[PDB]
Amino acid sequence: ATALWRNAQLATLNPAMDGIGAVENAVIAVRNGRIAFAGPESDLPDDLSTADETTDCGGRWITPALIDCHTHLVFGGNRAMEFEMRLNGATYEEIAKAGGGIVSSVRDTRALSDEVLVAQALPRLDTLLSEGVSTIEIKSGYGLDIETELKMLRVARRLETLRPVRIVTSYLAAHATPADYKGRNADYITDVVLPGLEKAHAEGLADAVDGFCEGIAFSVKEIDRVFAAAQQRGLPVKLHAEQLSNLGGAELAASYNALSADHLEYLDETGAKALAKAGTVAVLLPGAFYALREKQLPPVQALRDAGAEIALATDCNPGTSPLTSLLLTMNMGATLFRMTVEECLTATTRNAAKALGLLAETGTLEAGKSADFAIWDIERPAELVYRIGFNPLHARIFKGQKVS
Amino acid sequence: ATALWRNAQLATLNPAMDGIGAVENAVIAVRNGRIAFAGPESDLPDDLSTADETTDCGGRWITPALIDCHTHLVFGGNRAMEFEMRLNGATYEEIAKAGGGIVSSVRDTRALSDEVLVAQALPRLDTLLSEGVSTIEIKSGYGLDIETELKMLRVARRLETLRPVRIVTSYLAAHATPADYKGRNADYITDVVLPGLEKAHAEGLADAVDGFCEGIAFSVKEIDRVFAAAQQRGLPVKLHAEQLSNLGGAELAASYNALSADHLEYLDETGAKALAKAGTVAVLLPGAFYALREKQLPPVQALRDAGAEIALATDCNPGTSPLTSLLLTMNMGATLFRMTVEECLTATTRNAAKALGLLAETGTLEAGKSADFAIWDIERPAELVYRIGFNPLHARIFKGQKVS
Numbered sequence: 001a002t003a004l005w006r007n008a009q010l011a012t013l014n015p016a017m018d019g020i021g022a023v024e025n026a027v028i029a030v031r032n033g034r035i036a037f038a039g040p041e042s043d044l045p046d047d048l049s050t051a052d053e054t055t056d057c058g059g060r061w062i063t064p065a066l067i068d069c070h071t072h073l074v075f076g077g078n079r080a081m082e083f084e085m086r087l088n089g090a091t092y093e094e095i096a097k098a099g100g101g102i103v104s105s106v107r108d109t110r111a112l113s114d115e116v117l118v119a120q121a122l123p124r125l126d127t128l129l130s131e132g133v134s135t136i137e138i139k140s141g142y143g144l145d146i147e148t149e150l151k152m153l154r155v156a157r158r159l160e161t162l163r164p165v166r167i168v169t170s171y172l173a174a175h176a177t178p179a180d181y182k183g184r185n186a187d188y189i190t191d192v193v194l195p196g197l198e199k200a201h202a203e204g205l206a207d208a209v210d211g212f213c214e215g216i217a218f219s220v221k222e223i224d225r226v227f228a229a230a231q232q233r234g235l236p237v238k239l240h241a242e243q244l245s246n247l248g249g250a251e252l253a254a255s256y257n258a259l260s261a262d263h264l265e266y267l268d269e270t271g272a273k274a275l276a277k278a279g280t281v282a283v284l285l286p287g288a289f290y291a292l293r294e295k296q297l298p299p300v301q302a303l304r305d306a307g308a309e310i311a312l313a314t315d316c317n318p319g320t321s322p323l324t325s326l327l328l329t330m331n332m333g334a335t336l337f338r339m340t341v342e343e344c345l346t347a348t349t350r351n352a353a354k355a356l357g358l359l360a361e362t363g364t365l366e367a368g369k370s371a372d373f374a375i376w377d378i379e380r381p382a383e384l385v386y387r388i389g390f391n392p393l394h395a396r397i398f399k400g401q402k403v404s
Numbered sequence: 405a406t407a408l409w410r411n412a413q414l415a416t417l418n419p420a421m422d423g424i425g426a427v428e429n430a431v432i433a434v435r436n437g438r439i440a441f442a443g444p445e446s447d448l449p450d451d452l453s454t455a456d457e458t459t460d461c462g463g464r465w466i467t468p469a470l471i472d473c474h475t476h477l478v479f480g481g482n483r484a485m486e487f488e489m490r491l492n493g494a495t496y497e498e499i500a501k502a503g504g505g506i507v508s509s510v511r512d513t514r515a516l517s518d519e520v521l522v523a524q525a526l527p528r529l530d531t532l533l534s535e536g537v538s539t540i541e542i543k544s545g546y547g548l549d550i551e552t553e554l555k556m557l558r559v560a561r562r563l564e565t566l567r568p569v570r571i572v573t574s575y576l577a578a579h580a581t582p583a584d585y586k587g588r589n590a591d592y593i594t595d596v597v598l599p600g601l602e603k604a605h606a607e608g609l610a611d612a613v614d615g616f617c618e619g620i621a622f623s624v625k626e627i628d629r630v631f632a633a634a635q636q637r638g639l640p641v642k643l644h645a646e647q648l649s650n651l652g653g654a655e656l657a658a659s660y661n662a663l664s665a666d667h668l669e670y671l672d673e674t675g676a677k678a679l680a681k682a683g684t685v686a687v688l689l690p691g692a693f694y695a696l697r698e699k700q701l702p703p704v705q706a707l708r709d710a711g712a713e714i715a716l717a718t719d720c721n722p723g724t725s726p727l728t729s730l731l732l733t734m735n736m737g738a739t740l741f742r743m744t745v746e747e748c749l750t751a752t753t754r755n756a757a758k759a760l761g762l763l764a765e766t767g768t769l770e771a772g773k774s775a776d777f778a779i780w781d782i783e784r785p786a787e788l789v790y791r792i793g794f795n796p797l798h799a800r801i802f803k804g805q806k807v808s
């Protein structure tokens with residue numbers, strides 16, 4: 001099965017090229033869901049000069065399909081109630097008494113069946129897919145008990161069977177301490193987090209292990225205990241770090257050659273250099289920054305100077321970032337974090353694939369990788385970062401197949 | 405013709421009811437594109453108990469159709485180039501040389517035919533309609549010469565013939581001076597603004613007259629000249645005021661019984677009281693605030709205390725607010741301006757209708773008004789303000805007709 005997509009402008013994001021690796025008057029040759037060639041039509045090899053199908057792209061821009069490397073897409077209910085209460089002047093106490101807080105998401109997720117959870121996640125998933133997203137990372141963390149943490153992962157795996165999308169999962173039991181384990185973080189890790197990890201891995205439901213290293217959650221030493229366990233099983237790790245303060249969560253992840261460190265509002269120069277050295281991707285999440293009215297900006301320039309790679313994600317979750325648009329995420333990255341257009345595009349493609357350890361499989365338009373790309377009805381790549389609340393997607397191709 | 409919409413929850417936004425005027429187990433009877441009844445299914449008149457068609461809404465929420473009372477939907481090209489340049493550290497001088505700045509939009513709008521401007525606007529219009537918007541205000545202001553200013557208004561009128569939408573226009577020749585009139589605000593008003601207004605009025609192309617009162621634009625005295633001409637031709641007025649400084653534009657608008665005063669970042673207490681006293685709606689535009697990285701927040705509390713009505717709009721334009729989502733606008737009003745959920749829902753329906761002088765015609769679910777409403781797939785109305793980058797629209801009814 002072969003197919004050609006010619007007469008196009010390519011944003012290959014090939015790291016061997018400058019900028020976004022733009023190629024004019026180009027073509028993409030596909031064979032069995034894989035890219036056989038991506039470059040000038042004049043350089044198209046002879047054995048690939050023909051195919052079963054040929055699509056005239058009319059000179060439109062083609063980029064790698066987008067990747068959302070950080071989301072909590074699976075969960076029950078929503079947190080609109082406390083949103084409204086907060087705006088009405090309610091205190092944290094009044095909200096808590098009304099049932100607000102992360103406990104609301106935990107309760108709502110524990111109460112639903114896999115079937116219902118899939119039903120509630122599909123609308124969120126489809127919104128991302130409609131914007132050219134082909135790969136999405138989904139975390140657990142709203143169960144805080146083995147039974148529910150695992151259910152969340154099964155739901156994620158299930159979603160992948162209902163839509164043309166690539167889904168990778170992260171075990172995040174080390175998200176918060178349940179009421180029944182208050183003041184006993186160690187016991188929670190011993191009784192819930194670790195045995196949960198072994199079970200998830202045995203079930204093949206977890207692609208990575210995540211954690212929340214913060215003053216209000218788990219300490220560096222506590223997360224270290226979780227990473228050690230994951231490392232022994234061959235599972236890559238990642239971490240929510242320096243979101244609300246500088247604890248050293250970033251340096252910890254870097255010491256474990258973590259796939260990424262996420263949020264990083266309070267990351268320092270030392271931590272940035274550590275991430276770059278370890279090759280750990282810095283995942284910035286503008287949605288949470290925006291929704292939480294945060295004032296401390298992540299150290300973009302320090303990350304740039306250290307040579308660290310920056311990725312951007314929606315951090316889609318009901319409590320701090322009920323965001324379902326990766327296009328908007330890039331606009332926020334530029335507007336709020338002052339990232340350049342080149343950085344924003346690379347952040348949701350090449351670096352996003354890297355943050356998920358899938359760069360060899362997808363993320364760029366290079367021969368040998370999966371044929372996952374998005375055709376855009378734009379005149380300039382910048383349009384994807386410039387517009388606010390618009391979708392110029394023309395077509396989405398997943399594994400060589402035009403899906404929508 | 406007649407029709408019924410039963411088994412639904414209503415957010416009538418009736419000013420006689422508390423909050424957003426919510427009605428449980430309600431129905432909507434429509435006759436000749438008008439609302440015959442809207443309220444409890446039990447209070448339904450036997451006369452309206454029967455209809456040609458009936459629709460079961462499955463208990464879904466229904467609100468008046470949304471209204472975008474402030475946009476510059478019509479224009480040629482886009483400003484993604486300078487967006488990219490600025491992020492790369494380009495100076496204004498460098499951007500100007502690259503052809504950037506408002507001159508880019510004026511040049512493009514003047515160069516494109518009426519037909520092309522219609523086509524370039526359709527995607528923006530459709531994105532708004534996809535969100536349940538049924539009434540949209542479109543301004544001219546990117547022509548800066550009589551022929552182009554009128555062309556923009558004709559384009560706006562023409563759009564109404566291509567889609568199920570109510571479009572109101574605003575003559576905004578007093579937006580800025582073009583290259584040949586810099587330093588000559590008086591002659592510009594004399595040669596273009598006033599004669600253009602006369603011709604626009606003679607052709608029935610303008611529903612209102614707008615202006616930009618600011619240091620970098622026209623003074624109070626200059627705008628007063630334009631408003632006096634508007635008054636003489638029986639046309640209502642509105643004004644872009646206090647966006648970058650406090651010049652007293654709001655106060656002038658109020659003296660002319662302005663339908664609305666928009667932006668208002670620098671509005672003082674005296675100004676807020678003048679608006680409430682005159683009945684002028686305060687139109688806040690979070691898109692421009694966000695995109696321009698503004699630091700001065702409009703006086704929301706002063707507006708609340710003075711009793712002024714607040715509306716929210718996209719201010720969709722290529723230069724300062726390339727925003728095409730009214731749902732996102734509400735989330736920004738809440739997130740950036742700290743407006744309550746009730747204020748945000750009212751800001752895009754009842755108060756928006758008022759800002760356009762259309763309250764007697766639409767904006768609330770009351771008998772005698774146009775049957776324009778949106779059916780949503782939501783649990784609570786707060787969800788429309790809470791989510792970021794999501795569209796829960798189930799169906800759109802325009803003048804009693806299901807269109808989306």
Ligand SMILES: [Cl-]
């Ligand atoms: Cl074309």
Ligand SMILES: [Fe+3]
Binds near residue numbers: 072317
């Ligand atoms: Fe997260």
Ligand SMILES: [Fe+3]
Binds near residue numbers: 474475476644719
């Ligand atoms: Fe405006």
Ligand SMILES: [Mg+2]
Binds near residue numbers: 378
């Ligand atoms: Mg095109």
Ligand SMILES: [Mg+2]
Binds near residue numbers: 660
């Ligand atoms: Mg008056």
